[PDB]
Amino acid sequence: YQPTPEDRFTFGLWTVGWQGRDPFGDATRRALDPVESVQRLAELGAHGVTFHDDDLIPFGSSDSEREEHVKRFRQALDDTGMKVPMATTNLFTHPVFKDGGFTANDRDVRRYALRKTIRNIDLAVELGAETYVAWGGREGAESGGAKDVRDALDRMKEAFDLLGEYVTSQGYDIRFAIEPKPNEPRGDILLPTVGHALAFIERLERPELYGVNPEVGHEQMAGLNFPHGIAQALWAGKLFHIDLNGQNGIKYDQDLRFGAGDLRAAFWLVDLLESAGYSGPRHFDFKPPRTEDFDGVWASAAGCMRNYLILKERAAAFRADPEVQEALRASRLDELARPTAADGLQALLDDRSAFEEFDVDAAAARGMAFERLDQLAMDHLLGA
Amino acid sequence: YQPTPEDRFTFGLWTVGWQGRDPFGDATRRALDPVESVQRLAELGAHGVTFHDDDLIPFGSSDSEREEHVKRFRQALDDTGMKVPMATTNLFTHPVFKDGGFTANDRDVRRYALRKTIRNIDLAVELGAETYVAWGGREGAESGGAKDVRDALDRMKEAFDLLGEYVTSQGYDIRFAIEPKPNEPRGDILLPTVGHALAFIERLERPELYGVNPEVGHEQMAGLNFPHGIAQALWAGKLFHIDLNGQNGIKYDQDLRFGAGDLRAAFWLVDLLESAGYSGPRHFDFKPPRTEDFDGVWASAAGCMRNYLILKERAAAFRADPEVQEALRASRLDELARPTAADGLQALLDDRSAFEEFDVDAAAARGMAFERLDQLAMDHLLGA
Amino acid sequence: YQPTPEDRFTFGLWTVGWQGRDPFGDATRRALDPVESVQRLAELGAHGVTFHDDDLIPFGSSDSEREEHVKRFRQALDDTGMKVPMATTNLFTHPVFKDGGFTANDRDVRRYALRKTIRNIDLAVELGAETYVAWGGREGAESGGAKDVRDALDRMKEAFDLLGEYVTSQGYDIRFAIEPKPNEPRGDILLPTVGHALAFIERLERPELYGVNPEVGHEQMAGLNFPHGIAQALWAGKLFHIDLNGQNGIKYDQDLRFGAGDLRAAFWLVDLLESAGYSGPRHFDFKPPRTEDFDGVWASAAGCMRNYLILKERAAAFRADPEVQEALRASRLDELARPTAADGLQALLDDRSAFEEFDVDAAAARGMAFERLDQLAMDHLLGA
Amino acid sequence: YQPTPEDRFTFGLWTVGWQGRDPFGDATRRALDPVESVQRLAELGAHGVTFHDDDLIPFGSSDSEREEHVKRFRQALDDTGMKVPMATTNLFTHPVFKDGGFTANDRDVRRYALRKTIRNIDLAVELGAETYVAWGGREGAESGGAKDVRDALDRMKEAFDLLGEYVTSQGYDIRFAIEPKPNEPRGDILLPTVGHALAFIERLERPELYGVNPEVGHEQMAGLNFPHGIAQALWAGKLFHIDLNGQNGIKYDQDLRFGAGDLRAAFWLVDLLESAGYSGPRHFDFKPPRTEDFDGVWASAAGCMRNYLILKERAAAFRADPEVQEALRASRLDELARPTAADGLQALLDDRSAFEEFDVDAAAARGMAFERLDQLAMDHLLGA
Numbered sequence A, B, C, D: 001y002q003p004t005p006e007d008r009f010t011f012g013l014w015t016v017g018w019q020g021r022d023p024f025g026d027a028t029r030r031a032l033d034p035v036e037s038v039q040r041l042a043e044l045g046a047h048g049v050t051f052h053d054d055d056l057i058p059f060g061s062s063d064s065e066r067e068e069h070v071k072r073f074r075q076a077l078d079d080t081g082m083k084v085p086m087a088t089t090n091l092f093t094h095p096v097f098k099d100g101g102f103t104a105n106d107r108d109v110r111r112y113a114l115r116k117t118i119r120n121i122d123l124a125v126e127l128g129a130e131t132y133v134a135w136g137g138r139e140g141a142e143s144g145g146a147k148d149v150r151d152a153l154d155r156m157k158e159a160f161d162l163l164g165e166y167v168t169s170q171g172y173d174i175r176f177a178i179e180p181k182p183n184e185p186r187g188d189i190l191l192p193t194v195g196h197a198l199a200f201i202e203r204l205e206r207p208e209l210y211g212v213n214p215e216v217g218h219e220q221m222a223g224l225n226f227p228h229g230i231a232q233a234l235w236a237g238k239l240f241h242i243d244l245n246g247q248n249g250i251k252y253d254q255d256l257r258f259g260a261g262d263l264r265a266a267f268w269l270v271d272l273l274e275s276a277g278y279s280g281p282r283h284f285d286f287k288p289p290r291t292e293d294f295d296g297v298w299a300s301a302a303g304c305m306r307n308y309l310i311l312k313e314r315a316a317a318f319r320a321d322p323e324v325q326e327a328l329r330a331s332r333l334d335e336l337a338r339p340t341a342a343d344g345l346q347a348l349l350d351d352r353s354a355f356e357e358f359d360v361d362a363a364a365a366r367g368m369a370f371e372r373l374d375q376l377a378m379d380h381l382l383g384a
């Protein structure tokens, strides 16, 4: 279960570089130079790395320092063959963003958020990124009177439209991917789920430039089914990128390594990504637990890729098994894929077998055989 | 705090008529004749009533029985002055819908679900309903292999498109409102939140014919903020109807009376509905607890309306209070409502005050004053 | 992975016999005669069956009918070799228990609950049960003023003490096991978790006669860690029985088959039961989904046992693997098992290495190596 | 609604002194000198303040610095009349406690945790504290193999027993109060709820020296009912202290000001504390949101006390209202408080009215009248 470049495994600098500070605790690890992270990730088999502006160039850097940080990072990419498929802006750490970046009540802060984002889009394009993620972690509120949500959505649409106008004006090919999160750090965050983000994009001036970047743990923090949400994003043609990790139910964002947390949902997620032919990066946005030292960081990163590969094998074995294919037919998954009334409305209205002469009791008595199907899925996942 | 017709308070026959059966218990109340419910609700001050096909006409009724049930119900509406603003189809009780109505794996069941829905749309229009709700409570799954979600969304779009074609073909003015629910009775339900439902409608052939019918307790079962979701529905122009009740967090659907459950969210919800000028029915979809007898049913129904009216008074007093208006300005809610960059992209890019000369520390130091604002909101809610 | 009698797999009559009625749906399966269930379960490899009074003898049965129902059930046990290790009372279905059995506000109902329980304890002992479960599903409230909790705990202690006095007076060897549940059907249920139940037992007159019957899905409905709760019950010497099933997080009680839901928690649970040498029944309290017909019921029941057996194999392989034993030492699990200060308080107070000369930085720098350990656990669970 | 000394309102130095750092953000406020916090809290009407060792004396302080910090703090207490009723140890911030203090796998860390705790107990007693809180925020795990829970409970009992032996040996009158939390910062924390903590105390060598310090938001993070848990702690005689704040359901620990979050549960909590005659500190363990500046910190602290006082008034008005007293009788709360069978077991067994001649249907038909009672409670809370 060894990673290959074709696996398109990527990691954020902030994942393996997380120093272990939490709401109740100081750092447990020293900061990592991005150069070292790129070298270690490449040795593990990763194919790419992603960054926030402030992960790559320390906030408040001079132009000379900025150029030096980029130069060293570019050298590490060149030394390893690593790609930079995606970048994003830090609009959450600095205290100025305490009430948001794009939807801050203070208009001067909203303007500043856009200028900081635009500067980094230019850098992202220079490093070859195809996707630019927006995670509005500070957009939201802890109390009802603090944020009029319709006004905040107007400000959020305004900002995304300006960014769309900027990329179009520069002839860039980069597309945006909005990453939903339901809460944390704000009490409630705006566009809290993949559904809210999909609905919002359809009101933007150039919707084609935007998609979603769903994260396993985020949808799970709302107790939602992550593979279902990904299916709806795929159905919309909007799965531009994805963040893989684990989460143990409704609680704070744990960012466990992928495979940890809800193992069965990880299995059905990989089954769906592979069956649907998702072709973007398989990006891990996780945090090696603060209990770990540097050796445990790299073990945790390797485990993300290993788990994806084991799950890929088992889901492929499941779908290819003739006994599973027979069970899928027994459960009528083939009939779910056939149109309900390709004959048309009038034909349906005149079809007595659809109503007047439909034997509801006979239909009701037919078992769905879903448990047998699911135990074949469990046996394949466990290699039983 | 006495209801008036202008309050547009409505109730489902199945709410006050709920007999108290739960997963672990038999009925605690006798069935109510819809005629009696219409009479009692009208005496409490309600203005309208809603129904599923099977609440008004027992499933499997002959045409003569159907006509008789409707005749008596029409007489009660006429005797009381009560309206029927909304109706819906029962696509969840009968065992034939065990795997769904519109998204059942069995194609014959999907066709039957549409024929049952169409028959009731005709009746709804005859009774004067303006909104027809779809609640796909059986659409979903308990296991991963049982339902391919992209195929189910294709079947769901197909069904909604056929229904849109049917209402258009009859020249009806009725519009549809899809009611999201994240789970229960299925392990996970398709279109689980207001966001997913809004995003789905934008892929339908005639999106203008569809909106949402969000329910307080449903969004709260995903731990989401209900007033935020309603704000996004309003922002989209899609709040066609609403279901009001209470819920105590993430657990089974409690359907408490409105005002119970999360009282502060009820306050901010009524504040938003009234400020936004929502003009549809204020419909209660709740269940008087099974501990209650018939007298407690009517007390619970009256309490729904009373609570809405007390909250309406307190939210109006809050928004009208000059001290609150000053606090809103102190927290910059006025600046949230002003465009970020009406000057345009190029002007923003050339504005040094937005970046090069923006004093982030001075901006960061400015408190938002949200706690003072929220304690004024608490004082108004409590009449302190 | 075929069950043997030594596996002590048991099932409630109400599990495979569940007819599929839910809050929104009618039965999807015909009732099962307990005789048929005992025969089918025995054919699958189960070793025992459990019952509520009302599952075995229909509520309101005459003495002759009661004797006949018992006679046929005894014949089926004799025909199959099946055991009856545990029984319990239905104090939740009948409307008289709408506000509780032992803690009903109506005193006449509390007395009746005790008389109904006592009658069935006599029957349980006659059928050979060693454990009598109490699940106070109706003990609790939907509103604050409805139940004074200190008074309800007094009534609950009174009832358990009377039951303890009754078994002691008859010379029975049967012991009680209280099954916690946090909510559903009541908004909040009294003794909501294994901790609350353990604490309550320590205030009973004969605490030795009571233990707990924790259920996987119940603790998970509070988002608690089920193996941790079982560890605390074991630590207390109070794990008298256990209910095995699956649950997908915080939501209504799903009662999926064991292995479904949180698969990693099922793995750590079986690892703990086996390592601790738990010797009671491995009882499944689950509901085959209502999508299923009779064939799917038996497939679901078989899957419960299969999953327990696969997890038993993988956890045993994990603990026996020398590489895992080395990792456990690397993570200091051996040092967790050694007393902190067997040298005593004064020796600790005078030990400069414990404070004055303790190098906190050197200790802090040592990684815990938990991720490597956990990926060995994942590899064993998946057979990778 | 102005605080008085008799209200016993207290606050932790770390509450109003919280600098606003979160998992995704830097500090938004400068550190406060404890002297200033004591002065400001006293001006607001608080009566006492509490501390962790490391809030009062910076970690790694020399003896001279330690004495100076204490001297200035003692001067501020003397200048204001403020009390120090409770203290606790910081066993979570420093990286050495990354795997716990008392239950760290590393034995040297467990010894160090006890020595750090003992040093601060001496200081707490010198400052007049009556209660010493233990919050084992780092005791727990993110993965199954990392912590054997029975061994960790042995180590936890060992540590508490040594602390009990230490206070007894010094003749101190101080008692301990264990504060449960279900998760955060560890994936799952040991003794996750008030029930688990109560059960654990009953296994300690001197149980009389230990009680609980429940926190509103903590029990709510498990979706549990906080007033119910407090009722069980009161029933056990173990409510030694309490932490008051708000929380909006199951998610990360928000620590909102008291009254925010679940307002109805705050009402029933204050009703219970006052009716039961709880006589310990009404301590606020909350964090003014990081959106706020210093003025908003003091507004938030004042709001905690104001809300407690408004709720105290409304709950007292509720219990004193003759119409509410009549409703309580109508709902049989008086019968809940009467023994079920003071006549004894044999009298119950021979009482035909308890079984043979009990009319279950007549009893079942009696409504509980809980909705009318609850709407009187809502009307009192809102002053309607």
Ligand SMILES: O[C@H]1[C@H](O)[C@@H](O)OC[C@@H]1O
Binding pocket: A088, A133, A134, A135, A179, A215, A243, A285
């Ligand atoms: O993906 C986002 C992540 O979830 C957050 O924690 O940091 C910003 C990243 O863009």
Ligand SMILES: O[C@H]1[C@H](O)[C@@H](O)OC[C@@H]1O
Binding pocket: A329, A330, A331, A365, A366, A367, A368, A369, C293, C295
């Ligand atoms: O028993 C069921 C079978 O498993 C399924 O495949 O077809 C319907 C039948 O009723």
Ligand SMILES: O[C@H]1[C@H](O)[C@@H](O)OC[C@@H]1O
Binding pocket: B088, B133, B134, B135, B179, B215, B243, B285
């Ligand atoms: O609004 C829906 C309700 O939530 C459900 O329980 O019954 C169908 C109704 O249409």
Ligand SMILES: O[C@H]1[C@H](O)[C@@H](O)OC[C@@H]1O
Binding pocket: B329, B330, B331, B365, B366, B367, B368, B369, D293, D295
């Ligand atoms: O103190 C703050 C004030 O409350 C707000 O209104 O303006 C910013 C100031 O910094």
Ligand SMILES: O[C@H]1[C@H](O)[C@@H](O)OC[C@@H]1O
Binding pocket: C088, C133, C134, C135, C179, C215, C243, C285
């Ligand atoms: O174990 C209990 C189960 O969880 C409940 O649903 O039925 C009573 C059983 O005793």
Ligand SMILES: O[C@H]1[C@H](O)[C@@H](O)OC[C@@H]1O
Binding pocket: A293, A295, C329, C330, C331, C365, C366, C367, C368, C369
């Ligand atoms: O690297 C760590 C190792 O994995 C563990 O076993 O001992 C502490 C070391 O610091």
Ligand SMILES: O[C@H]1[C@H](O)[C@@H](O)OC[C@@H]1O
Binding pocket: D088, D133, D134, D135, D179, D215, D243, D285
């Ligand atoms: O009460 C505890 C609080 O909940 C935690 O966050 O800090 C330690 C305090 O002792």
Ligand SMILES: O[C@H]1[C@H](O)[C@@H](O)OC[C@@H]1O
Binding pocket: B293, B295, D329, D330, D331, D365, D366, D367, D368, D369
């Ligand atoms: O209607 C009910 C009344 O409200 C209660 O107080 O007594 C039982 C009666 O049945």
Ligand SMILES: [Ca+2]
Binding pocket: A215, A217, A218, A253, A254, A255
């Ligand atoms: Ca995350």
Ligand SMILES: [Ca+2]
Binding pocket: A179, A215, A243, A285
């Ligand atoms: Ca992410």
Ligand SMILES: [Ca+2]
Binding pocket: B215, B217, B218, B253, B254, B255
């Ligand atoms: Ca509902």
Ligand SMILES: [Ca+2]
Binding pocket: B179, B215, B243, B285
């Ligand atoms: Ca509804």
Ligand SMILES: [Ca+2]
Binding pocket: C215, C217, C218, C253, C254, C255
């Ligand atoms: Ca259950």
Ligand SMILES: [Ca+2]
Binding pocket: C179, C215, C243, C285
């Ligand atoms: Ca059970």
Ligand SMILES: [Ca+2]
Binding pocket: D215, D217, D218, D253, D254, D255
């Ligand atoms: Ca807290």
Ligand SMILES: [Ca+2]
Binding pocket: D179, D215, D243, D285
């Ligand atoms: Ca606390």
